[PDB]
Design a protein around this ligand. Structure first.
Ligand SMILES: NC(=O)c1ccc[n+]([C@@H]2O[C@H](COP(=O)([O-])OP(=O)(O)OC[C@H]3O[C@@H](n4cnc5c(N)ncnc54)[C@H](OP(=O)(O)O)[C@@H]3O)[C@@H](O)[C@H]2O)c1
Ligand SMILES: Cc1cc2nc3[nH]c(=O)[nH]c(=O)c3nc2cc1C
Length: 205
């Protein structure tokens, strides 16, 4: 049976917005959890269901995950680089809600730093990366079908659908367009080939 209903977390972020637009255009019935609905666009494709609330509130997460076939996680801290547990605590709530509701597929974005040499993280990004590592642990220990998406720098290049996906953080480049990253997260909904793996999408634009 194919995935039809999905929840997206972080849909108002850079990658989230284009993942959401692509998912709706592709035919998915999409639910989003957003703190502030004014951050969703009026033009273009629109989510089927909008839950207003916070990924740190279990009940809000629960309402969002109920009834879904799969979950996409594109949480982040925007330009905030201070020490943080928002992503990992959010993922804890998502896992609990998935288990409560029988949902078994999650595709979640962290970063290529979790594949590269772990002493090459730029200092200003260490705190966020530490929480990406906590989030990754939460998801891989959940006992759910988890695709870990670990992108390099996220750019603004056009959608191509022509990027390369490796399993080790080596690839044709150190950039992926936000649109291609979103396309890849949706690709992960229709294959099991990356379940239980870490993936590195990249492309030369
Ligand atoms: N930037 C890069 O080059 C790069 C490269 C590799 C990996 N990454 C990682 O890739 C992931 C996606 O990044 P992005 O740039 O697309 O993200 P982003 O622009 O930071 O968007 C973060 C998203 O998370 C949502 N969010 C944050 N706190 C939340 C909360 N408490 N409750 C509900 N939602 C919350 C934000 O909502 P609001 O709209 O309400 O703020 C927004 O939708 C991030 O984890 C980032 O660290 C980034
Ligand atoms: C190459 C690369 C750049 C990044 N920039 C980033 N920039 C940012 O503001 N937050 C991040 O979490 C972030 N992660 C990155 C991860 C990788 C692998």
């Amino acid at each position: 049976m194919a995935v039809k209903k999905i929840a997206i977390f972080g849909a108002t972020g850079q990658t989230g917005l284009t993942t959401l637009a692509q998912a709706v255009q592709a035919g998915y019935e999409v639910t989003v959890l957003v703190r502030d609905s004014s951050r969703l666009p009026s033009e273009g494709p629109r989510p089927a269901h909008v839950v207003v609330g916070d990924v740190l509130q279990a009940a809000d997460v629960d309402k969002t995950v109920a009834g879904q076939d799969a979950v996409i996680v594109l949480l982040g801290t925007r330009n905030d680089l201070s020490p943080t547990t928002v992503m990992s605590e959010g993922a804890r709530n998502i896992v609990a809600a998935m288990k409560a509701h029988g949902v078994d597929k999650v595709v979640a974005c962290t970063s290529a730093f979790l594949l590269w040499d772990p002493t090459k993280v730029p200092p200003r990004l260490q705190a966020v990366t530490d929480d990406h590592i906590r989030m990754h642990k939460v998801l891989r220990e959940s006992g759910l079908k988890y695709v870990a998406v670990m992108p390099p720098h996220i750019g603004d290049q056009p959608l191509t659908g022509a990027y390369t996906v490796t399993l080790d953080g080596r690839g044709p480049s150190r950039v992926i367009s936000k649109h291609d990253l979103g396309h890849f997260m949706l690709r992960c909904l229709t294959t099991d080939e990356y379940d239980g793996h870490s993936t590195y999408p990249s492309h030369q634009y």
